[PDB]
Design a protein around this ligand. Sequence first.
Ligand SMILES: CCCCCCCC(=O)OC[C@H](COP(=O)(O)O[C@@H]1[C@H](O)[C@H](O)[C@@H](OP(=O)(O)O)[C@H](OP(=O)(O)O)[C@H]1O)OC(=O)CCCCCCC
Ligand SMILES: CCCCCCCC(=O)OC[C@H](COP(=O)(O)O[C@@H]1[C@H](O)[C@H](O)[C@@H](OP(=O)(O)O)[C@H](OP(=O)(O)O)[C@H]1O)OC(=O)CCCCCCC
Lengths: 344, 344, 344, 344, 144, 144, 144, 144
Amino acid sequence: RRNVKYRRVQNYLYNVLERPRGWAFIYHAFVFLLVFGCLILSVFSTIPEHTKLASSCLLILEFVMIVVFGLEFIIRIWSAGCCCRYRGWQGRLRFARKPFCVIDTIVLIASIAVVSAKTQGNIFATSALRSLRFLQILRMVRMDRRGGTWKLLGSVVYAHSKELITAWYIGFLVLIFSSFLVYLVEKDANKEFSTYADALWWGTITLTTIGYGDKTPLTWLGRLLSAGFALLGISFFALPAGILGSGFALKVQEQHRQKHFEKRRNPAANLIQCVWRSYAADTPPLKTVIRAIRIMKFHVAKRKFKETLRPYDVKDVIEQYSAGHLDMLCRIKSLQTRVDQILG
Amino acid sequence: RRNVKYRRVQNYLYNVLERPRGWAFIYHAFVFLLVFGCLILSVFSTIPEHTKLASSCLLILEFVMIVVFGLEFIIRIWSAGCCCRYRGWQGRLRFARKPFCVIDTIVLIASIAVVSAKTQGNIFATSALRSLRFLQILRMVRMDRRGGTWKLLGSVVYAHSKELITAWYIGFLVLIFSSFLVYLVEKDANKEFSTYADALWWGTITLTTIGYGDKTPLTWLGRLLSAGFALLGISFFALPAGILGSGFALKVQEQHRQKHFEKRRNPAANLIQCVWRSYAADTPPLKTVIRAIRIMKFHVAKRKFKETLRPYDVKDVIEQYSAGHLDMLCRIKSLQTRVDQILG
Amino acid sequence: RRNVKYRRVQNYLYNVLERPRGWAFIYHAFVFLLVFGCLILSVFSTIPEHTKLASSCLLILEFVMIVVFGLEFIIRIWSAGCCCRYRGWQGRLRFARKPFCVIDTIVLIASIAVVSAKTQGNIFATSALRSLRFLQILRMVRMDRRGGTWKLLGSVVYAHSKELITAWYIGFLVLIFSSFLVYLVEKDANKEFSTYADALWWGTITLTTIGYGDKTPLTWLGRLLSAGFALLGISFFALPAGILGSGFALKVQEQHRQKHFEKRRNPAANLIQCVWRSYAADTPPLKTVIRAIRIMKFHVAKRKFKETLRPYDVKDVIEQYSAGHLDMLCRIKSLQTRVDQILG
Amino acid sequence: RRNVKYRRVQNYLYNVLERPRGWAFIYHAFVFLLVFGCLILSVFSTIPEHTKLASSCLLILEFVMIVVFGLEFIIRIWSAGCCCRYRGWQGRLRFARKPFCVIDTIVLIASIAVVSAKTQGNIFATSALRSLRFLQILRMVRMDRRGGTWKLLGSVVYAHSKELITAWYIGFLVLIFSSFLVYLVEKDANKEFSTYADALWWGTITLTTIGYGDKTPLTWLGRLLSAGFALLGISFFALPAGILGSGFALKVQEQHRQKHFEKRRNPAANLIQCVWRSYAADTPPLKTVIRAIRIMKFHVAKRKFKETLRPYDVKDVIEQYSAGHLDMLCRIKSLQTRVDQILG
Amino acid sequence: TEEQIAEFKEAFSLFDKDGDGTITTKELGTVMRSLGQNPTEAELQDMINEVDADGNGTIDFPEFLTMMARKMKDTDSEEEIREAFRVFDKDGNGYISAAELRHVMTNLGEKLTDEEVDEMIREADIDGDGQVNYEEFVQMMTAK
Amino acid sequence: TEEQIAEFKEAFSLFDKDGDGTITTKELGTVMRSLGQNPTEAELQDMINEVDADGNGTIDFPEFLTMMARKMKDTDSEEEIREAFRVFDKDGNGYISAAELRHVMTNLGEKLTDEEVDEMIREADIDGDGQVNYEEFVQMMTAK
Amino acid sequence: TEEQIAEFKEAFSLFDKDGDGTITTKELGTVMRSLGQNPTEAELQDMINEVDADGNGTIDFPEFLTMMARKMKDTDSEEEIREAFRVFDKDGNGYISAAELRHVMTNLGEKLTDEEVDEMIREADIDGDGQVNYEEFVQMMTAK
Amino acid sequence: TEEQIAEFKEAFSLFDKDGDGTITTKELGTVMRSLGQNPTEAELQDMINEVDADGNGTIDFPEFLTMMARKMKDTDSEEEIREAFRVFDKDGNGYISAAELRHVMTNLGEKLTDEEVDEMIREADIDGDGQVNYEEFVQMMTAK
Ligand SMILES: CCCCCCCC(=O)OC[C@H](COP(=O)(O)O[C@@H]1[C@H](O)[C@H](O)[C@@H](OP(=O)(O)O)[C@H](OP(=O)(O)O)[C@H]1O)OC(=O)CCCCCCC
Ligand SMILES: CCCCCCCC(=O)OC[C@H](COP(=O)(O)O[C@@H]1[C@H](O)[C@H](O)[C@@H](OP(=O)(O)O)[C@H](OP(=O)(O)O)[C@H]1O)OC(=O)CCCCCCC
């Protein structure tokens, strides 16, 4: 009851902290907003004008984050008993060495030191604080789970490596060439295309559609060449964004389709059934043989599930199709042969 | 005849107003053009130069919209009897409380007040009118049906939440880093990268390919770093547009495919058939039993239709495939067994 | 021989002119380059500096295009006998009224008049020539076949109408709002956000990632709001390009898949076979009956081909699948029933 | 042993050089970084300020690349015996005429000449060196295998030729028109829209979202027209990037799917089996007949493999489906007929 | 509802024709075989499955009472019938042709008697360019 | 068209061989069985379905008259035959090989007699690099 | 492990019932037929395939010993069972209903005895909004 | 090539065993049935189809001569065999395992005799981390 309730509160807090879903996302969004506001306030404090009000408002955030994050770390350590592998002093210590948890405590002590030094106000101390302010970004960093963003980005980039490389090479060529030509066309008339480095800077900014406007071609031949190469190189430089975005959309579509037609149901049901059968069986010799059979069934269901880990694709559908076709073929040929024997 | 004709005109006007298709879209486009022209005229009136001609031309639009919208509201209230649930005083009142209808009448009275106060010309009144002019935008707002645009955008964003988040995080990191480096490279040589806030502004504008040109790096190391980080961060910042656009295109493709192979025909035919059978049946006991059977058939067809609400996908095709395969398998195994019995 | 050869040259010239494929594309590209060079030369002649050399070089192009286009029109009129429906004076006249052909002759006489007036050199004449120069663009216009570009663009836009509309509405909202807020934040500090029209111009240019730089926010709150709304509205304003590009790519993919698995072979073979059978048949009564049967077979094959006009989709594959399944089902149930009767 | 080991080292070096995979990519990335750093250093040397330090640092790179590339060429020539077709003096000479190898040696001697002339320091010599520096880019060029980037880009462009052309034409029209209108609206008020060439330059830069800011419309009617045409033409000009990016993503997806469900296994196994059978068979007459049969089986497997070269698509799946359906149909109709005969 | 429950009990007694209290597939099939309908085994299976909610395989008296008590006129049912009619709506203007509807009912699904489809056509106002407002049919068949 | 309608009536009398006035599948099949064609049941079904438009299942005399009156030379039919020929067009230049056409007709679909395909080949100008303009075939078989 | 290996040898002797030393499909099937299980040929095929790793087609004594020695409590096996339970997790909050689990086990796959599913339900804390933490089941069935 | 053509004529005489001059499916099947291979009808069909190029359905002497004259060592054939071997290349480094190759040949396709696969393994240098360069096999089986 009371201890079971305590267990429950701990499980719930563990899910809202480490495995957010629904409202836990609202809490994590609140923490993200707090961290982002801290970063904005620090940036504003960089400005000499607002460094007065911004410093005081940011000081408040220091303690606000400090108190909030200390409370969250206390809850996380007190929680994490959901799996029960971290219960007890040794389990809590094992949890505390989690890379994200060690990072969190390091950011925590850094914030404590920042507040304490702001209290003391030493010169080297205050410089160290101006430097230690960014650490709250590790809170933004810890946000993601095992760097899921980096892994997804890398996966999609690697899948489209040839296209990104092809596209980027072609675009680079375009840039170099256009820069050079304009430079030849404008090396003398325009004082800003004086060196080829200037032309390369203009081409980079031009094709990337930034277009600062510090360097722009003045000669009409230069403007014509710039227009043509602008159309080409702009298409090429915008290409990688389109390739990666389309790849992301296609991967999302594929993941959604696979989720809709996932194969987990029957293997899971069989696995649980035989697992409980073995747990129950764990004459005497007949019961032992049945136990061995049930454990084997559990292992087979585990193997089938591990096979099903592979996402469904054209491979699986065509495989099942061909299997069905071969079964019907062999069975109906056998029926024809049997009926023939009947005729004989 | 005459009253049936009146009923007809009301139905037609209800479809052209609330359920546009074809020419109704041309009328709605006319109303949208009128509202958009009103907004443009108001914006122009904001300008001190054109505030003279624009004020008079806009005054005309006030009344034009006023008269047109009053007429449209009168038609909508007089219409909406297509369903017949809004006929009579109570039905018209029930219709008038529709959120879009209450919004429309509020905009209507606001326009009336604007015209009346322009007639009177009080100082506070005229300030209130300069403020109440935007309301015609609610006409632009009412345009969409139950916020279909917002719902579609939210659906596609949520489907691609991980990619938008991953991409945006990576892009933010890129920005912060590039801003900082350029700042270090140019904090002294360039007077516009004086504070890190200035560098962040430059990075935001640079990676977003806006490129105002107010801040641009001057040192050649700064330009090199800016070029590299420009390529990276530009790809990242343009990513969300590509992801969302591709997701929209894929969702459109999916909707079109599902529409082409929708499953509505047979369940609909069966449903209507059994519904009419029950309506007709509503010896005596045999007729009552047949009525019960027909009502049950209607309910079954309704359930099958509710099932068919789910858009067709790989799930449905593979489901029907597997069902057919199992039927043929069992039937042909039964035939083999039967023939075997014949042999015995 | 000689007249058959003449017929051949005319057919070949008709295909290279009206139905280009391969080298005909190289000739059409040459004509396009000539027209585009004429347009470039006219634009350059607009410039007071280069109006001297450009005028003479362009005059050459006048005659060059003139002579080339007159020759091409002569060839097109002399050709177009490939179908033989335009042979003879009446057929040539019928061809000459083709909208593209009438346009071509109008451009031809316009060019002749331009050259003649350049020879005469009247004031009003020369002004008319400065105006009549653009007509060569109709040559660029005639290029496309029945406005295929416009039809394709309209088709893809209409298919994605909801997404373009949703996206554009959301983006417009973003723009208006961001413009307004910055205006409030900067109406006084910045002299360029003096009126809301100025703020709207800044927002338009900002979100569209043009970023001229004439108006940029100076206050740091203004820059923060501009950055956030820049990220949002930039995604929204770049959305339509991504939606349409993705839609184009998906439609191309679909067209390619349909081409690979087109259903033309068997209906075409049957159609030609029965058509020739009927042409041959066109005892006596038995031959007449066979002729009627063959004409009916030709008409049936024509109907099946008209059905196959519809591009292949999930509909056709699932239709054939279900048909096959029902045939096997009925046949094998019949076999089971037959074997049962044997048992009886 | 020792010579077999030598053979091995040569094979390994040949794969890491010509057929990189894994670590070979890291070596090629190192060489690419070296070449790119050389290009950057040359560009910096173009700048009069950094031409002093950059010249010395670049000189080092000259020799660094020189020594590294000479070593690599020596290894490549010494290697390439993996196939054994280039072993011996004649084989090495045959390898040396490979277009990439001849290009590499030409770049090598060019670098040697650059170093030697830098040693001598002649005026014409040094000018030739300032010109011969770019050659290291051929090292960047040789990087790709048989111009895979160009071939992929051309393939995707050609597949989407109609959409790129349609889109580009529409965009060009938009540009011309918007430029012209603004020009009319601003030919007098604005001194920068003086000629239509200036308006065309503004439109090019505007729609391409470069937005230098040198020319921007000032009149409010001009700004309104610029905003509307900006939205339209921006969508059109950004279209080609989206089309090509989406096409790249779709082609990658297709390629991945085909790789997952490639048909190489069974034909390959049969081919190798019968090839070895024939190699073994190469009474006496019975053995010769078996040899002929095995060689025929090898040739049939080769033909089937050549057929399988064609990437899997809807064509292959539907083909196999229809084949299976026809086999079951004919077999089961035969079974029904046989059972009927039994009844008779 | 004593009259209604008495009628339901009499109907159940007629259905089962015995004191077992459970409705099996065979008896339900015989009920209509008496009228020469020739029910299918799957038809009877779904007939039984639609009344009971426990999966026992038979229709208990409380289950039949629950089935009968609920009213056909429901928001979900009305929407389902409305969309079923809209299946054959052209141009999205909410119009379905009378002759096209007649052909669809005659050919697709359980064929309706020609006279019955004629009454369907006449049950509402069918004139007016040959189109009949399906929502009128929905209102007529949702009134209970 | 008294001669034409008389010929059509005589043809219908030969087809049905009786005064029933309706053409059934069996009689239509027997018409060709007399010539040893061995028609299929589905073949006869589509034969009947193509003349009548009411779905009664038989070919009435007015329906056969309507079928016969219409002229084979039609814009839609001409386009269909043109695209059928274009099916085997290479490079989009409007050329189909004579030998490839012969093989396609011989193997795919209802096999044509070798002599008949030879006449097809000779009916137009087949020389000129071995290609035959299919549009010439379309004009020859659209002249009625 | 002399007791364990002796038990394994006795079990193998019971399984094969002969001195052949190889376990064939027929004998393995008979082992359970003695208990009236009626094994399938494919069932026995996968039974044999899961112990041996050479593909000979029979279960050798060392192969059975290798199968038995390995412990069910494994990281891979624990993860597989955890995901198998998560298959029926709603909202991603790690909760599976007791009644839904009972129905799933009863209907899908090899049906569990009602009493056995009841013990499954009672083996852990089932109360608390009707949901049972599947990870508790994983811990209970991974303890060996 | 008088010796070669004489050998080919003798081989054809042995194949057909008669003066017909055409090789039919039955005789070709009997040729191997004499050795107890039990050929399939489709096997013989593709056997005949691969020699003749006219589709007559039999192997004429000139067709067999054309088949035999061509050399197995061809660029296309060498590339096909190379890619067939690469089918089982891991990491794109051009290495195929000896044991994996043995298993693939034994199980997939027409099973090779264990001794024959052993000779395949020994025909080249198989050591060196257990991988065998498939290109060595290609060179060995492309030398004719
Ligand atoms: C900066 C350079 C960026 C280059 C890209 C980043 C460099 C990089 O290579 O990593 C991406 C990588 C690729 O992912 P990954 O290899 O697992 O992708 C699978 C892989 O291609 C398999 O071989 C495919 O199986 P198969 O053969 O078809 O059968 C499988 O397809 P399928 O079986 O499911 O159907 C693919 O899903 O894994 C990361 O996410 C780490 C992110 C590191 C990113 C760190 C920085 C973000
Ligand atoms: C600003 C933050 C934006 C975040 C995005 C907006 C925040 C947000 O979450 O709302 C989007 C949301 C998602 O839509 P929704 O949940 O219904 O999408 C379905 C959902 O994913 C189902 O679970 C899927 O079923 P299943 O599991 O696969 O079986 C189904 O796939 P399928 O069955 O059909 O195949 C999906 O279609 O619903 C709105 O449109 C409201 C728009 C609110 C937008 C309000 C502002 C525009």
